[PDB]
Amino acid sequence: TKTWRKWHVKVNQNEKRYAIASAVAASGVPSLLLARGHRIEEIPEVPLVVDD
Amino acid sequence: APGLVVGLNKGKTLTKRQLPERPSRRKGHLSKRTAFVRSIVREVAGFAPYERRVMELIRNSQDKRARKLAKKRLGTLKRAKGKIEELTSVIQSSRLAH
Amino acid sequence: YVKTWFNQPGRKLRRRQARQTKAAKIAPRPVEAIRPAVKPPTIRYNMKVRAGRGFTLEELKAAGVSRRVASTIGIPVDHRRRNRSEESLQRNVERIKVYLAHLIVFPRKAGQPKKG
Amino acid sequence: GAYKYLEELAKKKQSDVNLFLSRVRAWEYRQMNVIHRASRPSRPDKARRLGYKAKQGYVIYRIRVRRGRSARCTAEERVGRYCSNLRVLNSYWVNQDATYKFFEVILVDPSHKAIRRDPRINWIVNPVHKHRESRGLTSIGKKSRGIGKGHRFWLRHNTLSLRRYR
Amino acid sequence: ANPRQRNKQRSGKPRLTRRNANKKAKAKIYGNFVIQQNWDKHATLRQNYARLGLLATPNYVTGGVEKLYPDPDVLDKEISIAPAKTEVVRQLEEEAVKKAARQSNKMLPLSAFEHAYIQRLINKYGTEDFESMAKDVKLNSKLFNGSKLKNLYIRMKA
RNA sequence: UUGACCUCAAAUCAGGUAGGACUACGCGCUGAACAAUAAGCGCAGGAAAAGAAAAUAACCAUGAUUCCCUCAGUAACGGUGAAGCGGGAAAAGCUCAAAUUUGAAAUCUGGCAACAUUUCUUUUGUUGUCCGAGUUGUAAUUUCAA
RNA sequence: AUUGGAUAUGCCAUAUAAAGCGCUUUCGAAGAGUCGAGUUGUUUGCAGCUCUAAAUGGGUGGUCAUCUAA
RNA sequence: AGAGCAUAGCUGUUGGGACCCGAAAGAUGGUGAACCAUCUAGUAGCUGGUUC
RNA sequence: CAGAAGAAUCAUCGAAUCUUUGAACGCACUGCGCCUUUGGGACCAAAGGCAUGCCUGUUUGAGUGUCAUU
């Protein structure tokens, strides 16, 4: 085993922003929240916003 | 606001200024005192054995061999030319004094 | 002979921490000294403008700062650079003048013997 | 005043004055030990311009090395090893003959309070300068290893710097 | 692994520990008391210089400065200072004036020796031909020049 | 002669300092296989070395050194194999020799005396005096940027 | 408790002194068995040997530019 | 009336200790012809093996 | 187990102690000494030191010195 193995992997930024804009978009869909295991069957509204 | 703004350009308008003299460029000038010091020591230390033989060749007037000997001993003509001019300056001065 | 860059996030934070202690030691003054504007010495980049090492002696005298004090108020000196174009003298004298506009100088107490 | 005149009298090393001195001095130096103390430098102006000052803690040792590694660089390694406590400042050619080269090596006493309190020669008391004749940090050491600015003057090749993201 | 590391691991002596690791904590400010008082202990020096009205670097930033919020013929001329954009800069500037105010008496008095020195010259060679009074040597013992004699004349006034 | 000055020695004459160890990093000398390579030898530090151009360049010219990125597997060599440029990190500059202080060796170690001083009764200084060092040159001064 | 760089303030200052900028009808020293040459080893420099210099000179680059070694 | 550039994968190829194991070495430096330690992952077209 | 009840097979730690050896230091490598001081109850014992090179200085003497010197 050699320490100069490839540990860190490059992703273009515009790939990272797309994967995270998509990740933010899918947090507003209640189905993809239950289907991930989140117990939000009584949450008043999605996306859930509070005041400052 | 002190700020460096790099890139693009800053200006195409050019005005050359006649640059001064730097004193490090002044190196190699013949100081009036040190010429006397070098001359006096040249008189005192005498002459090199090879350089003494150059004087006789000049006195005997085989200048062609004198150049050959100095060039062989020193290494290049300009080094040999200066020595010959240095030597012949001695010879004429000794002959007028003595 | 192989080098690894695992300390790359370690070295960057060490540099930031090294900047913060410098700022602590010298509070009012900036962590960086001012540098002049010069042009790269090649046909490829000659139209560019970047930073230099320090301000030449014509850049200090024209701006109105002696060469000895300049080292003390943070203006660095380059005895090797010279001004061949006036636009190079102009871009760096005004660079000094704008710096002395924003430069607060703290007075220092001075020995005052009773006699003279 | 004088070291101007001594500068140009030492520039002519085969003139009669010097050659007559080269024979006289070499004969008496070979009569001595190989490494021996010298009260006053055999070349006062050269020792002066190389750093030597006529004050306590400044020492000079003359050494002959067989002709036929640099000879002057040798003189420094042999003198320093002889005077284990002194730090070697410099070295200069004094004389030579058909079978030997005579070198004088200037040393400094790192403990003498005339030196330790001298603002200009203090740098030699610092342990980083222990035996500069042994590491190659003297003038001839700097030359003999080709150190300097120019175009005429290893592991950076073999290494394989693999950045974190490659 | 090593012998020296391993014998003291087996032994009974306690390890020479040092609880020195304080990650993420910045260097506390000493020096100018004004900026220390207005120095946020959490913000970075680029943030604190900016918040305090000071330039951390007069030279170009080599990177991308933070965007926290969506932000919407002359060699003789002199730049007439820069007004302070913050109170704290004015606090630093005000102290500069007061420190200079205390150190205002830059004129020096005279000691007895140079006092009578200047009277002996003045009452003999008037008060205007300073070059001539520097030319005399019988009274000008130290052989001062005209420039320094005038300085003594001005300094003796007050 | 005296006695100076020079050398020559010795002393359990006072004050010192060197050695061996470590060796990852570092500076040298040196070295065969299979390559400034292992080894061998020598010398150090918390870094070592390097360092304020006898440096580039042919430009609107740059400007101590060191490391990083690129220049580039490029030029060149004949596969070996760089350097300016550029972009970053960091930045700080300096001291001598060569000048007659010559209207005044103004310089300095050591002994002794008190005064102090402390990571410290364990440190490090000053003042005074005496003796030496030094005029074959110790201070100030000046280092080419002048 | 032990120290560090600053501030505040008391006392002491040998200043007859010491600096920067300025103007010059006066000046301006510059590192030799070194550079350099032939030649021989080592790996271009370095090393030995043979000789061995100069003063707008000397090194290096392109009659010019830059630099100022020992 | 330009189609690349960058990342990830797959297979291929060239190096690198290079699928694993196995040929007298040689050299450096030591110990009392012998022996030891390292350079060394020295050398292979070959041998034997290479896993649901 | 013992063991005391400022305990502790404790911590901290700035004071002393730190066997013979080893760069290893009197010569030797077990012995043999030397010198000085301390003393014993002239001699002996103990203690102290007694290794080389080099540097600054002090004293002593000598050189075939150079003089100096009526």
Side-chain angles (χ1 to χ4, degrees):
Chain A
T1 39
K2 292 305 181 190
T3 42
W4 40 92
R5 181 201 308 249
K6 199 61 213 316
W7 305 107
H8 309 74
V9 166
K10 276 184 296 204
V11 186
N12 326 326
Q13 215 169 20
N14 197 263
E15 277 171 321
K16 275 173 188 175
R17 285 149 173 181
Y18 190 177
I20 280 151
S22 155
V24 175
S27 87
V29 189
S31 46
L32 309 165
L33 275 55
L34 286 52
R36 224 197 73 80
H38 288 282
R39 289 325 187 286
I40 61 142
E41 283 83 348
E42 211 81 14
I43 287 322
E45 189 207 357
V46 170
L48 185 46
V49 195
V50 281
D51 90 323
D52 312 1
Chain B
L4 193 56
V5 170
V6 304
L8 260 197
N9 67 338
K10 200 172 290 296
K12 278 272 280 182
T13 299
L14 261 206
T15 316
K16 303 293 187 163
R17 336 167 68 246
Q18 188 43 267
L19 280 183
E21 279 277 280
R22 277 154 73 90
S24 98
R25 285 234 170 100
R26 187 91 202 187
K27 198 158 179 186
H29 179 272
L30 180 60
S31 176
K32 280 106 65 166
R33 166 173 165 253
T34 190
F36 160 85
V37 189
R38 271 164 204 171
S39 176
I40 214 170
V41 156
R42 150 94 303 175
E43 182 295 335
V44 154
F47 302 88
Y50 94 98
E51 161 185 70
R52 281 271 188 195
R53 154 151 31 81
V54 166
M55 327 196 318
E56 192 203 78
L57 254 56
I58 290 295
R59 278 186 178 94
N60 154 285
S61 291
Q62 282 304 326
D63 56 352
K64 195 88 163 297
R65 284 94 182 97
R67 246 168 304 289
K68 287 199 191 298
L69 169 62
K71 184 261 151 190
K72 174 246 192 171
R73 227 65 160 154
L74 299 185
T76 199
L77 269 283
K78 57 170 304 312
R79 286 178 170 213
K81 294 161 58 198
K83 187 78 70 143
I84 280 189
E85 296 304 320
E86 201 134 12
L87 261 303
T88 193
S89 51
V90 152
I91 300 315
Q92 61 189 131
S93 290
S94 291
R95 279 300 98 201
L96 60 92
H98 309 79
Chain C
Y1 317 117
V2 69
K3 138 89 178 198
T4 54
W5 292 57
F6 302 135
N7 49 330
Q8 201 182 9
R11 164 203 317 287
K12 177 193 170 39
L13 162 77
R14 154 173 50 251
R15 296 183 161 156
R16 300 198 80 218
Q17 296 183 317
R19 271 185 276 274
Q20 285 244 15
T21 167
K22 186 201 197 184
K25 189 201 184 313
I26 52 180
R29 19 180 281 180
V31 305
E32 269 194 9
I34 183 158
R35 309 280 155 199
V38 312
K39 292 196 171 278
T42 280
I43 193 52
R44 179 160 167 191
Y45 308 93
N46 68 262
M47 92 306 313
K48 200 180 184 307
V49 154
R50 56 155 177 92
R53 191 184 159 79
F55 300 82
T56 192
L57 298 156
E58 310 139 349
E59 283 164 34
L60 304 148
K61 226 61 193 173
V65 180
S66 63
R67 66 157 320 185
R68 254 81 191 161
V69 317
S71 313
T72 87
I73 47 158
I75 299 168
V77 194
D78 187 356
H79 61 279
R80 285 164 283 234
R81 200 161 61 73
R82 50 200 67 78
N83 293 128
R84 297 184 201 80
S85 88
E86 146 74 5
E87 58 107 24
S88 34
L89 188 142
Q90 185 209 41
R91 73 165 41 116
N92 270 349
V93 156
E94 317 281 358
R95 171 97 166 133
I96 293 166
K97 264 165 172 146
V98 66
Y99 180 76
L100 274 173
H102 306 62
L103 202 62
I104 302 156
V105 281
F106 282 34
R108 167 192 52 146
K109 60 216 80 48
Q112 204 95 76
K114 315 303 175 300
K115 310 282 108 173
Chain D
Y3 321 102
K4 198 69 172 67
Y5 291 77
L6 292 186
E7 154 193 333
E8 315 106 355
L9 181 163
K11 278 158 137 181
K12 336 262 176 64
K13 299 176 196 55
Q14 312 287 47
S15 44
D16 46 49
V17 168
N18 286 100
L19 208 45
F20 165 88
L21 257 288
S22 274
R23 295 288 330 251
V24 171
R25 279 213 257 271
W27 163 241
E28 66 160 50
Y29 291 160
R30 255 187 52 202
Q31 280 193 332
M32 289 163 189
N33 203 350
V34 157
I35 302 182
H36 42 286
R37 178 88 187 272
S39 49
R40 294 152 219 72
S42 42
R43 309 177 62 194
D45 70 301
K46 185 81 181 162
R48 179 152 186 76
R49 92 159 52 84
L50 289 210
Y52 168 81
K53 319 273 291 196
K55 60 145 69 185
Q56 290 153 292
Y58 278 88
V59 196
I60 278 179
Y61 272 65
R62 200 180 299 105
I63 170 169
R64 53 156 180 269
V65 279
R66 321 205 82 262
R67 323 161 78 96
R69 193 190 169 67
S70 168
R72 184 186 152 201
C73 204
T74 294
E76 292 177 336
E77 290 232 46
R78 286 190 196 174
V79 168
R81 193 132 275 158
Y82 194 71
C83 318
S84 48
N85 50 318
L86 305 187
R87 310 296 176 70
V88 47
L89 180 70
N90 232 1
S91 168
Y92 55 96
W93 186 89
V94 307
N95 191 4
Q96 84 179 359
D97 69 345
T99 72
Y100 276 102
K101 275 176 162 342
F102 300 84
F103 284 109
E104 256 180 348
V105 178
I106 316 155
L107 304 100
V108 184
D109 204 351
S111 303
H112 205 267
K113 285 278 177 29
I115 289 294
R116 298 180 80 90
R117 291 180 189 141
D118 205 354
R120 303 156 138 124
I121 200 76
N122 269 136
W123 57 271
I124 211 162
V125 201
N126 296 333
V128 65
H129 294 121
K130 270 173 210 160
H131 272 248
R132 326 181 321 149
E133 95 277 332
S134 182
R135 269 172 281 147
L137 316 166
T138 57
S139 184
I140 183 53
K142 285 164 111 159
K143 199 259 279 180
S144 297
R145 62 188 211 182
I147 281 288
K149 306 200 171 161
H151 73 274
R152 296 314 250 179
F153 284 85
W154 159 83
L155 191 44
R156 198 226 191 271
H157 148 281
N158 286 300
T159 179
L160 196 93
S161 164
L162 296 182
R163 320 201 272 207
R164 216 156 44 110
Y165 300 78
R166 46 157 208 273
Chain E
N2 282 257
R4 180 198 260 110
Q5 308 304 336
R6 208 221 194 276
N7 211 316
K8 54 183 195 165
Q9 179 190 228
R10 174 172 58 252
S11 284
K13 264 161 272 185
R15 180 192 259 172
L16 271 196
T17 326
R18 281 210 88 126
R19 50 171 60 124
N20 265 120
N22 59 322
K23 275 299 205 196
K24 317 168 50 142
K26 298 155 188 50
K28 271 159 197 92
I29 288 283
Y30 47 107
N32 209 349
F33 177 60
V34 164
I35 286 165
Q36 143 190 322
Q37 287 296 127
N38 302 275
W39 194 263
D40 191 329
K41 92 200 185 317
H42 171 45
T44 69
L45 77 87
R46 270 227 205 275
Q47 297 193 329
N48 268 309
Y49 269 65
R51 190 182 50 78
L52 284 157
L54 309 167
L55 289 188
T57 63
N59 293 290
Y60 65 108
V61 175
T62 84
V65 312
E66 205 45 48
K67 196 169 200 289
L68 264 174
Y69 292 91
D71 292 333
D73 46 350
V74 277
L75 167 48
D76 43 8
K77 195 196 283 183
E78 80 209 342
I79 327 290
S80 186
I81 217 61
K85 299 163 315 300
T86 325
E87 168 35 14
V88 185
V89 188
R90 215 267 296 159
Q91 213 186 331
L92 300 171
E93 181 73 325
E94 182 295 335
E95 288 179 350
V97 193
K98 180 53 178 65
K99 267 152 76 76
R102 154 72 226 169
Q103 313 174 190
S104 46
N105 184 17
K106 290 306 186 178
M107 271 318 267
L108 305 97
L110 296 202
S111 192
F113 163 80
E114 69 263 27
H115 203 317
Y117 200 110
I118 220 64
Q119 323 294 150
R120 194 165 57 259
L121 261 292
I122 271 168
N123 56 10
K124 191 65 182 295
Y125 299 58
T127 193
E128 299 302 323
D129 37 353
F130 280 92
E131 180 73 35
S132 81
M133 83 187 339
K135 184 157 296 298
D136 162 60
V137 317
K138 298 74 185 161
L139 330 171
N140 225 351
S141 325
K142 269 293 178 77
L143 269 177
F144 285 108
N145 53 340
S147 62
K148 206 168 170 187
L149 284 183
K150 267 184 67 176
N151 174 34
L152 293 178
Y153 180 64
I154 308 284
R155 284 176 48 193
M156 77 92 76
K157 224 147 269 178

